[PDB]
Amino acid sequence: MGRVRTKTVKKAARVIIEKYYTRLGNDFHTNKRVCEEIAIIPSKKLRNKIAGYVTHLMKRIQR
Amino acid sequence: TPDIKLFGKWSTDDVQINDISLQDYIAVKEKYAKYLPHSAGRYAAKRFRKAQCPIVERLTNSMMMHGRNNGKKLMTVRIVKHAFEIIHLLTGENPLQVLVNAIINSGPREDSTRIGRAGTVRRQAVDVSPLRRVNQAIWLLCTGAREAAFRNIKTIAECLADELINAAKGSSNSYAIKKKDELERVAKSNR
Amino acid sequence: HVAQIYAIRQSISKALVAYYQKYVDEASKKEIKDILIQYDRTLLVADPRRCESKKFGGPGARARYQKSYR
Amino acid sequence: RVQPIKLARVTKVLGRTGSQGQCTQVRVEFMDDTSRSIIRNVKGPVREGDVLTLLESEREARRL
Amino acid sequence: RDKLNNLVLFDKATYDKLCKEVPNYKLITPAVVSERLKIRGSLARAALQELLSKGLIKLVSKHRAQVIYTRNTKG
Amino acid sequence: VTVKDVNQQEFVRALAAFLKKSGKLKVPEWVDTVKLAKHKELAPYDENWFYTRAASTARHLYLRGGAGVGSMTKIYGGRQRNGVMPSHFSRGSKSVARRVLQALEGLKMVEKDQDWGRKLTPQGQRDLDRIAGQVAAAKKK
Amino acid sequence: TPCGEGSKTWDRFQMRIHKRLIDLHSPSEIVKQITSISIEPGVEVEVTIADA
Amino acid sequence: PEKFQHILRVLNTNIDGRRKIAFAITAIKGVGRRYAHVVLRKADIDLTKRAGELTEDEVERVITIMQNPRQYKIPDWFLNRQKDVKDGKYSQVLANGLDNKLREDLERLKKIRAHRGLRHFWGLRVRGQHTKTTGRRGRTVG
RNA sequence: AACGAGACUCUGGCAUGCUAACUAGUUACGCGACCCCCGAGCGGUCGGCGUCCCCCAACUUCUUAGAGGGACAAGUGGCGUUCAGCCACCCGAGAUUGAGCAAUAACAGGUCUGUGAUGCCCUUAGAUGUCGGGGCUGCACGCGCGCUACACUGACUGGCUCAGCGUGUGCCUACCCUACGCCGGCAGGCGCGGGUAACCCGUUGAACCCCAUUCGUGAUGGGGAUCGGGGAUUGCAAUUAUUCCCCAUGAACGAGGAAUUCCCAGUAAGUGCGGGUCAUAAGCUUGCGUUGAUUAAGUCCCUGCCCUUUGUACACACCGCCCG
């Protein structure tokens, strides 16, 4: 594969999970549409990454 | 089975593999039968993916070399239809059983390699993969017919079909079985 | 000549499948789909691969002209 | 050597060796007794669960 | 290249052997007739065409670049 | 049948024979001095080349909507070896094809039809399909 | 490079024009009315007398 | 069959009966393969058999159809020579006369002493060609 | 904290969803016309094959181009500090299709012959600024990039059958792309017509490929160098042969020493076409399709590059320095 997520993703991912904690599922598609609506995302492809990491954080935080 | 595909004339059942070390690297009858040896194919992008495509297809692929026969895979299938035809008439065996024997008898079992020590040539004998045996064995017998028809009245079809008889038998009157034992003769020495 | 043969084969195969899914029933085409995909040869999907562009400094899309030192 | 040809199968692959990575070390079980095991050097690209065809088992290897 | 020469016309012995090679041979191509006799390949081409008109040999496959012939299908 | 339903390599070799049997065609003087296309290195192996080319001409008129002397040449042109120089495409002769089409037209199996260009006569279209079924009747497609 | 020297490199430039057409059938007066209004950017327009 | 004869002599060059008729004839200079497949068809004989299978009656006609080509209606453009130059006619030249004709035109171009004959006599290329990297052979280097 | 990296832009692979089409198609009949019994049948009738006919018909799968959607290591199983991630697998089009853009610092690198960018120096009427005609192509050698070959997995002669990127007169001082008809073996000439271009050339009916004849292992018909004679076209002019055509002439070469180049998937290789230069002309270069493999899934051995530690008499930096 290759590819480790950049700092722009991991930095903003933390903010977005913190303040809208109770607005996340554990599904990709729901968490995608939420990020588009609660905040500006300057691209679509960038959104699809940041959502997926926000999802991955939300799995562990309930443990 | 009630829809069993031939080659348009040849059974893909009654085909034996006489090794347990080379079965499931020969592909000929699990469901690998087809009427032609032409496909789009996937032979790449994963290492274990070459062994999943037919032996007959592999044969067509490996005999199209020398810079003027590349991109002429269709001409190559012409040579294969005559080859099997001649093999079946000539001895009487189903000509796929011929090919499988020819592969099994021609594969080298030990080979040498290089090692740098003290600034002088030393050699080491090593073994071989089953996947290596198949790749080598397909190359070697095809080299014979390619060489033979390079200034002869005999056509490439005739040469290739002759070479599979002498390979399938233990005769040792072929370009393949000669060179097979040459390699092993080295491997004994620098063992 | 070659690529046309694969196109017409792929179309008539797919035609048959679609026809049964739409005017007959699901279980009609489900059998037939299973038969084809067993000996799959891109009989229900399209090959992605297409030619890659030539970029300068060599013939072809990946080969390079000879380079001589001295 | 001139003793009957042996057959032995992979239990585990270890790593690649040689002076260009051309050789592959592998551990093999003798396939006539699993308490017997030797390490070998093999030229080809081996995988897991494959069977080889050794012409001897007098030799014992561990690197080249 | 080598020096070799082939016969471009028929003789007695060529014709007689031509009749008797048939039941003994499974494969008969013009190339094999070139070797077993000393005869040109185009001469040998037409020589086999003659035999097929008698029904001594049987055609089994045909191509632009090759022609194959078999015995009498008696084994 | 339609000529499409039968083999076409076989079709022409029988259509040529039909014409030569019936005393048909008017044949040029030049027939043993003719290269038969620019890119060719040698004269025809066959003396019946006029009959042969008229077969292939009439077949194409059935298929495509028919076009002039230029298009007929374009169908026939192939590759020209240039020795040391690398190959090129070229288009063969004209005056041979212009006599072919005019000889067919003499029997009124072709005609200069609408929008200035040859088209095959309805009588012509009749005769093609007439022997087209004879091919399928004969051997068996 | 101005004046050849160094590795041979080139550069693909492209301009893409775009064409598109709207067919109307109406009186030519009201056409020239609606045409001339609500156009600000650099975009060309071509009016045609009649069509079949 | 047909054991009657083989290698023979015709005008100025020995022609084998081993080879096919058209290709056999080409050995004679001034006759290429293209020139022979015409002349055989004007003579109305097979080209599908060997040259040793021709009879004396037949080959006697061949040379007549060859050496009077205009009178057997082979076109003028299809000849070697059209208006030779200073001889006034269309001509067809064959083996030993070809060389004699050829040597004349060399001599002529040194008679007038054009650029041509000088290049001939010096042993250098007549036509527009570079000689800087061509010819070689050679030896003697610095 | 910043720059470079990625992000971004362009390009390719996925939509029977959306938007709408006589300069794009399809389907449906209506058909009437042609055609053959070609198929059921009989030849009628029904059906098949394409063209004209088609519509104020129906539609937008195919072609076109816009907005959107889709892909995330997302899911599952291993492995990892259980972190960052990695491997396999499911689903499906696998997160990686290819380019563009590209940092700090540097070189006494290239270009005063692109510049009416430019310093200084030089020359300037017997001119370094204009016409005529000649040369840059001159050959004992040497070297580099390529092209065509050494044949039968071929050549030759007939027959069959498939594309894509473009381009085009109306511009500079003068010029385009060409259908069609006629004449000529060919090169070509001649008479008419269309195209400012999804409209016309052009449904670009290209090559290798494919099928059947002929040649027969022979420096052979392989090879087409060299060279003789003749015909056309461009230009004011073709001599040192501009280019093209016809017939003749018929060389080296029988697979390549020491060395060495390039390449991992529609990739190598085979094979043709368009653009650029262009009065006339690609063996060049730049793009485009078609046919389409083998072999690897690695390593630091060689060549070279990045990071740490260490040694130094080196800093013009080992192409260094220095001894008798």
From Swiss-Prot, chain C:
Q: Which domain of life is it from?
A: Eukaryota
GO biological process terms, semicolon-separated: maturation of SSU-rRNA from tricistronic rRNA transcript (SSU-rRNA, 5.8S rRNA, LSU-rRNA); translation
Alphabetically, the GO molecular function entries are: RNA binding; structural constituent of ribosome
List the transmembrane segments: none
| Keyword NAD tagged | no
- Please tell me one Gene Ontology term that the record gives under cellular component: cytosolic small ribosomal subunit
- Cellular location of this protein? Cytoplasm; Nucleus, Nucleolus
Q: Which UniProt keywords apply?
A: Acetylation, Cytoplasm, Nucleus, Phosphoprotein, Ribonucleoprotein, Ribosomal protein
Q: What does this protein do?
A: Component of the small ribosomal subunit. The ribosome is a large ribonucleoprotein complex responsible for the synthesis of proteins in the cell. Part of the small subunit (SSU) processome, first precursor of the small eukaryotic ribosomal subunit. During the assembly of the SSU processome in the nucleolus, many ribosome biogenesis factors, an RNA chaperone and ribosomal proteins associate with the nascent pre-rRNA and work in concert to generate RNA folding, modifications, rearrangements and cleavage as well as targeted degradation of pre-ribosomal RNA by the RNA exosome.
User: How does the record describe its quaternary structure?
Assistant: Component of the small ribosomal subunit. Part of the small subunit (SSU) processome, composed of more than 70 proteins and the RNA chaperone small nucleolar RNA (snoRNA) U3.
The entry's family comment says: Belongs to the universal ribosomal protein uS9 family.
The protein, known as = Small ribosomal subunit protein uS9
Native species of this protein?
Answer: Oryctolagus cuniculus (Rabbit)
Entire-sequence positions represented here: 77 to 146 of 146
Curated annotation (Swiss-Prot), chain D:
The alphabetized UniProt keywords are:
Acetylation, Cytoplasm, Endoplasmic reticulum, Nucleus, Phosphoprotein, Ribonucleoprotein, Ribosomal protein
Q: Which gene encodes it?
A: RPS28
Q: What is its main location?
A: cytoplasm
Query: What HAMAP family would the database entry show?
Result: Ribosomal_eS28 (MF_00292)
Subunit details for this protein? Component of the 40S small ribosomal subunit. Part of the small subunit (SSU) processome, composed of more than 70 proteins and the RNA chaperone small nucleolar RNA (snoRNA) U3.
Give a short account of what the protein does.
Component of the small ribosomal subunit. The ribosome is a large ribonucleoprotein complex responsible for the synthesis of proteins in the cell. Part of the small subunit (SSU) processome, first precursor of the small eukaryotic ribosomal subunit. During the assembly of the SSU processome in the nucleolus, many ribosome biogenesis factors, an RNA chaperone and ribosomal proteins associate with the nascent pre-rRNA and work in concert to generate RNA folding, modifications, rearrangements and cleavage as well as targeted degradation of pre-ribosomal RNA by the RNA exosome.
* Organism of derivation: Oryctolagus cuniculus
Which protein is depicted?
Answer: Small ribosomal subunit protein eS28
Identify residues that carry Phosphoserine. 37
Subcellular location per the Swiss-Prot or TrEMBL entry: Cytoplasm, Cytosol; Cytoplasm; Rough endoplasmic reticulum; Nucleus, Nucleolus
UniProtKB/Swiss-Prot annotation, chain F:
Q: Which residues carry this modification: N6-succinyllysine?
A: 140
Q: Which domain of life is it from?
A: Eukaryota
| Location of the protein in the cell | Cytoplasm; Nucleus, Nucleolus
Question: What is the name listed in the Swiss-Prot or TrEMBL entry for this protein?
Answer: Small ribosomal subunit protein eS19
| Sites bearing N6-acetyllysine, chain numbering | 20, 108, 112
Keywords recorded for this protein, A-Z: Acetylation, Cytoplasm, Host-virus interaction, Methylation, Nucleus, Ribonucleoprotein, Ribosomal protein
Q: What is its main location?
A: cytoplasm
Question: Which Pfam families does its entry note?
Answer: Ribosomal_S19e
Has keyword Transcription regulation? no
InterPro entries listed in its UniProt record: Ribosomal_eS19, Ribosomal_eS19_CS, WH-like_DNA-bd_sf, WH_DNA-bd_sf
Which family does the record claim for this protein?
A: Belongs to the eukaryotic ribosomal protein eS19 family.
- Tell me if Repeat is a UniProt keyword of this record: no
Q: How does it assemble?
A: Component of the small ribosomal subunit. Part of the small subunit (SSU) processome, composed of more than 70 proteins and the RNA chaperone small nucleolar RNA (snoRNA) U3. Interacts with RPS19BP1; the interaction is direct and mediates the integration of RPS19 in state post-A1. Interacts with RPS19BP1.
Record-annotated disulphide pairs: none
Cellular component, GO, one term:
nucleolus
* Residue(s) carrying Omega-N-methylarginine: 64
From which organism does this entry originate? Oryctolagus cuniculus (Rabbit)
The free-text function statement in the UniProt record for this protein reads: Component of the small ribosomal subunit. The ribosome is a large ribonucleoprotein complex responsible for the synthesis of proteins in the cell. Required for pre-rRNA processing and maturation of 40S ribosomal subunits. Part of the small subunit (SSU) processome, first precursor of the small eukaryotic ribosomal subunit.
What biological-process GO terms show up in the record?
A: ribosomal small subunit assembly; translation
UniProtKB/Swiss-Prot annotation, chain H:
What is any one of the record's Gene Ontology cellular component terms? cytosolic ribosome
What's a single GO MF annotation on this record?
Answer: rRNA binding
Q: Tell me the keywords, alphabetical order.
A: Acetylation, Cytoplasm, Isopeptide bond, Ribonucleoprotein, Ribosomal protein, RNA-binding, rRNA-binding, Ubl conjugation
Residues recorded with modification N6-acetyllysine: 89, 101
Q: Where in the cell is it found?
A: Cytoplasm
Stored Pfam families:
Ribosomal_S13
Task: Tell me the GO BP annotations in alphabetical order.
Answer: translation
For this chain, the site of the Glycyl lysine isopeptide (Lys-Gly) (interchain with G-Cter in SUMO2) cross-link is 86, 89, 101
Main subcellular localization, coarse class? Answer: cytoplasm
| Tree of life domain | Eukaryota
Q: NCBIfam families from the xrefs? A: PRK04053.1
| Assembly and interaction partners | Component of the small ribosomal subunit.
Similarity comment text for this entry: Belongs to the universal ribosomal protein uS13 family.
Report the function annotation for this chain.
Component of the small ribosomal subunit. The ribosome is a large ribonucleoprotein complex responsible for the synthesis of proteins in the cell.
* Name listed for the protein in its UniProt record: Small ribosomal subunit protein uS13
State the organism of origin: Oryctolagus cuniculus
Its taxonomic placement starts with: Eukaryota, Metazoa, Chordata, Craniata, Vertebrata
Tell me the gene name. Answer: RPS18
